[PDB]
Design a protein around this ligand. Structure first.
Ligand code: OGA
Ligand code: MG
Ligand code: NI
Ligand code: ZN
Length: 331
């Protein structure tokens, strides 16, 4: 069995290997990369996403979100308070202000210590889930807006044509902006490209151990667990590496820098934080190996998780028994 300790693997494709996306995902899986839940892909030196980032300041962040925490330093939830619209140039200046800028630090480990110690005492502002792309239209390799669609994958594998579309999202981050513990919708893959700026630290639980994380989360968030049998779908709960280690939960960590891709694999729980002002692009995707995970994915039906238009068809076709209840949750 490849990668039996479920370590995060890092790949360096050549320019020739970077031509065929599906084939390279399948190659990484042949080496056991999916066992970790997360992999890093460093593009060949010949590749670029676009020519420059000098002209992005006029992008609008219509609904910046202030991430307000409750709990204790290692075990907390966050809620998202809506703020007034601002441009990417206004947001960059905000991120660099004395109130929000990254503190002085020695290295990534020191900054990680400071994050876990102090995150709860601040409320950073995040631009999230902004439909759009920063890939140049002429970038032919690993262009996140030109991937094959999940609806076409399901049709190719299962024969059923369905409605829906699949497009990328942009994220603008600052120091302490936080992504809560989650898997993707319908336990899909995701791919994330860090376009510019400061790093993102990731934490991940191997897919084969995901139920261990869920059992801990029920113990640590007991009211939330009573409210909903899949409350991690709400994307609000944080648990620190120290707390995971105290409770014997298997996980790994890695820092992504600008110019690097990360792939998350089906049912790989992940969480993390941004180091300072940055811009990332991400999209979900599927492969043949996903279909079995999609058929088994939990679902939130309490009303909280509320998701995209395109999830309807995935639930309807892969999970017909659950469809009626899930749809009540959506309405
Ligand atoms: O850019 C981001 O904040 C977070 N991304 C993810 O959880 C992902 O790509 O799967
Ligand atoms: Mg602009
Ligand atoms: Ni994710
Ligand atoms: Zn729910």
């Amino acid at each position: 069995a490849q990668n039996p300790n479920c370590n995060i693997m890092i790949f360096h494709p050549t320019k020739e290997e970077f031509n065929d996306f599906d084939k390279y995902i399948a190659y990484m899986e042949s080496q056991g990369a999916h066992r970790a839940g997360l992999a890093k892909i460093i593009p060949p030196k010949e590749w670029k996403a676009r020519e420059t980032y000098d002209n992005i300041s006029e992008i609008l962040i219509a609904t910046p979100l202030q991430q307000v925490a409750s709990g204790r330093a290692g075990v907390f939830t966050q809620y998202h308070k809506k703020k007034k619209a601002m441009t990417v140039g206004e947001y960059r200046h905000l991120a660099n202000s004395k109130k929000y800028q990254t503190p002085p630090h020695q290295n990534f480990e020191d900054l990680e210590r400071k994050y876990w110690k102090n995150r709860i005492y601040n409320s950073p502002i995040y631009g999230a889930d902004i439909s759009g792309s920063l890939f140049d239209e002429n970038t032919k390799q690993w262009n996140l807006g030109h991937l094959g669609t999940i609806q076409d994958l399901l049709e190719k594998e299962c024969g059923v044509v369905i409605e829906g579309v699949n497009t990328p999202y942009l994220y603008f981050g600052m120091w302490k902006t936080t992504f809560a513990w989650h898997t993707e919708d319908m336990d899909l893959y995701s791919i994330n490209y860090l376009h510019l700026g400061e790093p993102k630290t990731w934490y991940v639980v191997p897919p084969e151990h995901g139920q261990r994380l869920e059992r801990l989360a029920r113990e640590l968030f007991p009211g939330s667990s009573r409210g909903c049998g899949a409350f991690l779908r709400h994307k609000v709960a944080l648990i620190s590496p120290t707390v995971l280690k105290e409770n014997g939960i298997p996980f790994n960590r890695i820092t992504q820098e600008a110019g690097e891709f990360m792939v998350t694999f089906p049912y790989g729980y992940h969480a993390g934080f941004n180091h300072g002002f940055n811009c990332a692009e991400a999209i979900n995707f599927a492969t043949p190996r996903w279909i079995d995970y999609g058929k088994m994915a939990s679902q939130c039906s309490c009303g909280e998780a509320r998701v995209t238009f395109s999830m309807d068809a995935f639930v309807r076709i892969l999970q017909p028994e659950r469809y009626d209840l899930w749809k009540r949750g959506q309405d």
